[PDB]
Design a protein around this nucleic acid. Structure first.
Ligand SMILES: [Mg+2]
Ligand SMILES: [Mg+2]
Ligand SMILES: [Mg+2]
Ligand SMILES: [Mg+2]
Ligand SMILES: [Mg+2]
Ligand SMILES: [Mg+2]
Ligand SMILES: [Mg+2]
Ligand SMILES: [Mg+2]
Ligand SMILES: [Mg+2]
Ligand SMILES: [Mg+2]
Ligand SMILES: [Mg+2]
Lengths: 98, 206, 79, 114, 96, 151, 127
RNA sequence: CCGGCCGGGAACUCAAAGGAGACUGCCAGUGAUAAACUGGAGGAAGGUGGGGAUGACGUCAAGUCAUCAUGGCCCUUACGACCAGGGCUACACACGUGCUACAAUGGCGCAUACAAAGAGAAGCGACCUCGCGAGAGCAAGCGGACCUCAUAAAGUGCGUCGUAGUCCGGAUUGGAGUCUGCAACUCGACUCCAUGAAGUCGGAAUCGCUAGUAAUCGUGGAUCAGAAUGCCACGGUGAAUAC
């Protein structure tokens, strides 16, 4: 009925508002198709390192972007107030709809 | 040149990040500029307020901004006073609403950046560069600090021809990733030119 | 050779072409418009084509048509 | 086995022997044996007189050979006459399309010397 | 990187949308099979910087038109300067 | 090879005979990394050999190989001024690596149509030592012996 | 029950299900041939049935993806020995000495800024 | 509807978190009963398992005042600033780095099998339809393990070419076109049709690489309206040799 996408660059954290959310579901209402991992779109930016000349220097950075699914099948008005008003983790992107 | 920046090589572990928000490409850009626009402005204001760090998080249509300082009261002003007129301009820059925390800095002698700036502002004050490094390194070992080093660069005192000079008292494993190292920069804008400061401070491990 | 959907030509040159069609030619005719495609209605005229340093006289004809004004105004002096 | 051009080709598959004409390259030849009712890979053995001259017309359709040559010079001359960039280019022995001449213009500039 | 070169780029984006995207889509359909009256294209006398592709793309902090990166909006030189102060969320020296 | 003396990765003895040896052959004749086409060429050059000699397969290559096998070689030795083209005697282990190489190397420089063929014609000619490879050994020989003086 | 082993090689992933029936073999819902029997490695697939006989003693339906001709057939090769699992460890010792047990971990080594391709170095001249 | 497609299935492949695991520790010889090496066991992995990142005090007044910053210097109705057009793309040459070849381990037609890794809203754009084609019109899905970019190529199968400046090789030029963009003359990329140079494997001399490497085959990306033989990534097939 409701599934929540989670994205955030911090791995030791995304699954710790995943757990928090899964927990504030299984304790209230219930169901929840566990929390699903889901491929980590990781960019990469490789840049020239010397301000002038020396194209063999180069720094190589990446930005990992982590996913989490959740999926709650049974939507109890109560389990739908568990997410509401109890949430935080100001650095996870949470998508509620599809 | 050839030493990997000590803070950045640690981010993944044992070292934070002074911006922590999520954005997607599209806005990722405009936020990044917002950030280096609020720190720019702020650092010019709390200039002589001993601010060592300003963290940023945009919590969904919101910007939080902590200001790790070592003179909380001077930042805060007469009960809530200045923090307000900051809030104002900060929300009046980021283009969204601005809350604003003011974390305090104990044992600032231990703070890389505040250290550097100290030496940095002492050079513009016109004091012996030898003496000022020696002070740094001391009050630091003084209050703990398993190590520290501080070098300064060029025109040191004035010389037509430019030098450096470090001062490694204690432990500093810049190869040991676990090692807690608070590293930083500060440039002093003297009348004979510009001297660059770099302080490493070895706090711990694990 | 590109274009496909409307030969190009600047207005402020084209209205220099008609201030001499009706009127009848004058001396040369200065343009910095090496862009424009030469049109049938330019034959017999003498547009001056800027090539960088100054404007080169060029008498149009019945086959300098699908060619840019600037094809007849060498830009790099080589010798 | 002349066809069309002073040229007198054959002794292999037809679709290649046809290209022999100045005026044909693969496509126009495929179109030829196709639009004249012949099989690409057939030699001129088996290919009796009847089939040959049917082709001769099929190629006679285009401006091949001598005329093509004549017509191609015609063009190059036109350019040069108008004193345009691509014309002053043909005249000056260097390459027309835009290629660099700071180095490697050789095939149009001609084997080097001084 | 030379004020006046920035100030151009600002004017370039200003105009880039004052007109184009809007006014210059009296041009979008205008040049497609609605055929014809050629006064349709002729119109292009609109400033010049009015076109988007007339915008370079500058290290939002410094100016450098070279070594830009869209994600960040900066030149690799500032990208790394921020990179090593945290500054860029999620961005660390990667390996694999 | 300065300090860490080493061994040998042992390849997978031939997918159509069960032979370490020939699988060195194919690798050796293999090019641009096309094992597929590579064995295709020895199996069908061994197929023209095969019947044309009649003497089986395995053991027919083994003779032509036995021919262009080299017993001694001239090893450089640049000492003060002098080259010193020292003859010396070679291991069995490579003695057929070479031989296989000089064969593969020869047939590549032949004037026939197909590499299968060229290869075959080389195996054949060598069997009755009169080929380019045999010609090689009869110079690695002529070139030892002429500096045989040394020892 | 379906007795089985995974097995993979170089980005390939083949799963192998044994069942005592015949000597018929199906990879990706395909004849052994119809996939690559008649190709470079048609014979390695059988291999894990050397000292462990069959001819038509036990059946294997298997699927594999990722990598290529040799890589996939490598995985399979693993998964058969890995499924010979079930039938004891009194066979998984000459599966050792044969080597089919081992996971060949050779991967493709990345392209490293400053070289052409992992090890290939851009040619240099002193002047 | 023989499409994992609908129920279902939680097994397996994978997915991203967390753990375990390899330590010369075990046997054995070698070695001063040391360090270590060597070989064997077991094991997915043996002897820093494979790769990355990480570059000490320092050397070259080495590079960067043009990324930015800045001491001094100098111009200020000009060394600043606006617009146009042109130039950085020139061309007797010389050198460096690369791409494409000289060919049957190949060319070519046809059929056909097997990857990885990434990108995407002012975006990726299916489908359908039009066009020989580049493309064009229309139009669904997808902020994306869903949708699109996207139909890997080597390979394998038949077939043809028969050692030839060739059905090898594609330069150069003619003509006609497509898309981007106010704008493709200078100077964009691509496409159709014709054109078919040099080149038959390269003097002296000289570079790379020790294994999933070299060699070879395709794929993607950053910059970017457009403009990759470069650059940064990605798997496929897959060697030779070290006294
Ligand atoms: Mg050259
Ligand atoms: Mg400036
Ligand atoms: Mg641009
Ligand atoms: Mg590779
Ligand atoms: Mg210097
Ligand atoms: Mg210097
Ligand atoms: Mg200044
Ligand atoms: Mg330039
Ligand atoms: Mg060809
Ligand atoms: Mg070659
Ligand atoms: Mg090495």
């Amino acid at each position: 009925r409701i599934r929540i996408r989670l994205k955030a660059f911090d791995h030791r954290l995304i699954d710790q508002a995943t757990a928090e959310i899964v927990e504030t579901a299984k304790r209230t209402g219930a169901q929840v198709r566990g929390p699903i991992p889901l491929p980590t779109r990781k960019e990469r930016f490789t840049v020239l390192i010397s301000p002038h000349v020396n194209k063999d220097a180069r720094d190589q950075y990446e930005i990992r972007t982590h996913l989490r699914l959740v999926d709650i099948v049974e939507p109890t008005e109560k389990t739908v107030d568990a997410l509401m008003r109890l949430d935080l983790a100001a650095g996870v992107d949470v998508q509620i709809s599809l | 040149g050839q030493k990997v920046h000590p803070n950045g090589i640690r981010l993944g572990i044992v070292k934070p990040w002074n911006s922590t928000w999520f954005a997607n490409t599209k806005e990722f850009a405009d936020n990044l500029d917002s950030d280096f626009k609020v720190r720019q402005y702020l650092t010019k204001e709390l200039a002589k307020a001993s601010v060592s760090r300003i963290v940023i998080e945009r919590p969904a249509k919101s910007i939080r901004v902590t200001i790790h300082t070592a003179r909380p009261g001077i930042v805060i002003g007469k009960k809530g006073e200045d923090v307000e007129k900051l809030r104002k301009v900060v929300a009046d820059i980021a283009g969204v609403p601005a809350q604003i925390n003011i974390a305090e800095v104990r044992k600032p002698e231990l703070d890389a950046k505040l250290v550097a700036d100290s030496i940095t502002s002492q050079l513009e004050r016109r004091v012996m560069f030898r003496r000022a490094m020696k002070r740094a390194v001391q009050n630091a070992m003084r209050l703990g600090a398993k190590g520290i080093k501080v070098e300064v660069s060029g025109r040191l005192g004035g010389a037509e021809i430019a030098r450096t000079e470090w001062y490694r008292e204690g432990r500093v494993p810049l190869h040991t990733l676990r090692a807690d190292i608070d590293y930083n920069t500060s440039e002093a804008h003297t009348t004979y030119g510009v001297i660059g400061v770099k302080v490493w401070i070895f706090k711990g491990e694990i | 050779r590109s274009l496909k959907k409307g030969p190009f030509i600047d207005l402020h040159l084209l209205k220099k072409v008609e201030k001499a069609v009706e009127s009848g030619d004058k001396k040369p005719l200065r343009t910095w418009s090496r862009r424009s495609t030469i049109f049938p209605n330019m034959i017999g005229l003498t547009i001056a084509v800027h090539n960088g340093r100054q404007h080169v006289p060029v008498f149009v004809t019945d086959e300098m048509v699908g060619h840019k004004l600037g094809e007849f105004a060498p830009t790099r002096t080589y010798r | 086995a002349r066809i069309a051009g002073i040229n007198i080709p054959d002794h292999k598959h037809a679709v290649i022997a046809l290209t022999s004409i100045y005026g044909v390259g693969k496509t126009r030849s495929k179109a030829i044996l196709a639009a004249a009712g012949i099989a690409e890979d057939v030699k001129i053995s088996e290919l009796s007189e009847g089939q040959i001259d049917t082709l001769r017309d099929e190629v006679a359709k285009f401006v091949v050979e001598g005329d093509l040559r004549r017509e191609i010079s015609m063009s190059i001359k036109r350019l040069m006459d108008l004193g345009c960039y691509r014309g002053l280019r043909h005249r000056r022995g260097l390459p027309v399309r835009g290629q660099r001449t700071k180095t490697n213009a050789r095939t149009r500039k001609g084997p080097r010397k001084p | 990187a030379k004020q006046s070169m920035k100030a151009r780029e600002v004017k370039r984006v200003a105009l880039a949308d004052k007109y184009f995207a809007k006014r210059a889509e009296l041009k979008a359909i205008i040049s497609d099979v609605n055929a014809r009256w050629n006064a349709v294209l002729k119109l292009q006398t609109l400033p010049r910087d009015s076109s988007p592709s007339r915008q370079r793309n500058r290290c939002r902090q410094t100016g450098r038109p070279h070594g830009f990166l869209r994600k960040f909006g900066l030149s690799r030189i500032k990208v790394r300067e921020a990179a090593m102060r945290g500054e860029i969320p999620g961005l660390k020296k990667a390996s694999w | 090879p300065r300090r860490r003396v080493i061994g040998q990765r042992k390849i997978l003895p031939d997918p159509k005979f069960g032979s370490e040896l020939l699988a060195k052959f194919v690798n050796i004749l293999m090019v641009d990394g096309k094992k597929s086409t590579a064995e295709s060429i020895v199996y069908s050059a061994l197929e023209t050999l095969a019947q044309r000699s009649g003497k089986s397969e395995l053991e027919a290559f083994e003779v032509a190989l036995e021919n262009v096998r080299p017993t001694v070689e001239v090893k450089s030795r640049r000492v003060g001024g002098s080259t010193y083209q020292v003859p010396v005697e070679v291991r069995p282990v490579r003695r057929n690596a070479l031989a296989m190489r000089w064969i593969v190397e020869a047939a590549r420089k032949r004037g026939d149509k197909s590499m299968a063929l060229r290869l075959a014609n080389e195996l054949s000619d060598a069997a009755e030592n009169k080929g380019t490879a045999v010609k090689k050994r009869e110079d690695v020989h002529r070139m030892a012996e002429a500096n045989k003086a040394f020892a | 029950n379906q007795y089985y082993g995974t097995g993979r090689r170089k980005s390939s992933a083949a799963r192998v299900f044994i069942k005592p029936g015949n000597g018929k073999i199906v990879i990706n819902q395909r004849s052994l041939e119809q996939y690559f029997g008649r190709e470079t490695a048609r014979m390695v697939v059988r291999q894990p049935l050397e000292l462990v006989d069959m001819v038509e003693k036990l059946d294997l339906y298997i699927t594999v993806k990722g990598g290529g001709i040799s890589g996939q057939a490598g995985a399979i090769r693993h998964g058969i020995t890995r499924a010979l699992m079930e039938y004891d460890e009194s066979l998984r010792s000459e599966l050792r000495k044969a080597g089919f047990v081992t996971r060949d971990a050779r991967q493709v080594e990345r392209k490293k800024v400053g070289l052409r391709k992992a090890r290939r170095r851009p040619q240099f001249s002193k002047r």
